[PDB]
Amino acid sequence: MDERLLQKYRAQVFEWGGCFDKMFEALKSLIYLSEFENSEFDDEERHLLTLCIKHKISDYRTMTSQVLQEQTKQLNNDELVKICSEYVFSLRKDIKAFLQSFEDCVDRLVEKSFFSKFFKLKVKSDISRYKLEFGLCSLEDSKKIHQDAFTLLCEHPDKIEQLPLGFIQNLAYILSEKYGEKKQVFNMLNSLGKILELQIKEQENMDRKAQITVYLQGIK
Amino acid sequence: MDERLLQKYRAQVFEWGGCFDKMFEALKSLIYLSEFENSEFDDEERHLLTLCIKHKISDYRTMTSQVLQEQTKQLNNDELVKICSEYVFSLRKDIKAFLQSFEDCVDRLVEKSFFSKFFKLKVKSDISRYKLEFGLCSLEDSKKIHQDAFTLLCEHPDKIEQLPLGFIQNLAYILSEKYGEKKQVFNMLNSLGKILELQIKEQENMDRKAQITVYLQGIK
């Protein structure tokens, strides 16, 4: 066990203990080590990275809502209300800081495999949606990152099976329903569908035909 | 609003946000301020103090049990198990440190009212039970603190109504069921009962008679 494996273990154990700030410190070390050695993350490392932001955001939401709920039930205590507001503001400043640091890390992810390139853009897209909500980026800049991930997917139909189908569906869903690209997405996926139909036709192996069909169906 | 009131507010707000370590820092400041001014805690300050230890202990228990549960479900990963054990040990060391610091604070509580004297001993008793479990005190030393609180209660039957009835019942319950003083406790409470019967007999006011009866019944 070297430092990189230790940090995977520490990140998991901190996640189990609900210590998301210590988990993030271990992940920062993973990012640095992988970058230093120019060695792509494995899937367990990627999963811990996305769990970290999920948890930090969820905590922020819970803590904020708990304080605001209690604030409103205090009758006529202007001073206590001000303390609640100050605390709520600090929590928001801290989550914004977290998003900035986490995004620094994600930008430094090593890319080699097709999935690693798509993964970086997917996670950057996810970050941009939080940054949109929290006053850290424009709608234009957020949309652009989602478009970049969708473009990469569509430029390499031969490698579609290297990507999780749910990532594909969520990106399609977000771009069409939230960014007003329903027409672009339907058109691009129509084309991707045809390319997969051909892949299926040309694939001799019956089990492989069925595997590609999962994506073809998933895309419709 | 002065610093002492601010810290009451900060302690409450940190409790609402589930930030028990920040809550404890605010309480440490309350303790120092009250000690400095020789000015007894009010009941809201006392309640925040006992909430703090309740929460810290509950968190420790949850975090420990979560990590141990996951540890056992990993098949053959000796290195990850060792990391889990190291983390579990650190959490225990930290809760022990917390108990030491919290006990320092409680020892520095200002005493003036009868209830403030009983409260200090009651909280010290509660701390001693955790310290017993965590290897920080002997059974003898824990028992002694519980006896000191029970003695104070019994030496001042005229002031019984200044104490919460549940505190009295819990102390009686603990001393008789956990410290093998069933005989002492039954005897002392028999005597306290008789003193309250007399107080009731001698109290002209009917509403006051009923108020004392609540304690007389509670004690049986």
Author numbering:
A (entry chain A), B (entry chain A): 8 to 227
The authors write:
All 14-3-3 proteins are dimers, with each subunit comprised of nine α-helices framing a peptide-binding cleft. The dimer is shaped like the letter “W” from one angle, with an un-partitioned bicameral pocket where a substrate protein is held at two typically phosphorylated sites in the two component clefts.
More strikingly, Cp14a is further distinguished by the natural absence of a C-terminal tail ensuing the last helix. This is the first known instance of a disoriented 14-3-3 triad (superposed on Cp14ε for comparison in Fig. 4D). While the two subunits form an aperture similar to that in the human 14-3-3 proteins and Cp14ε, the side chain interactions around the aperture are primarily hydrophobic, with Cys26 and Met70 of opposite chains occupying the position of the Arg-Glu salt bridge conserved in most other homologs.
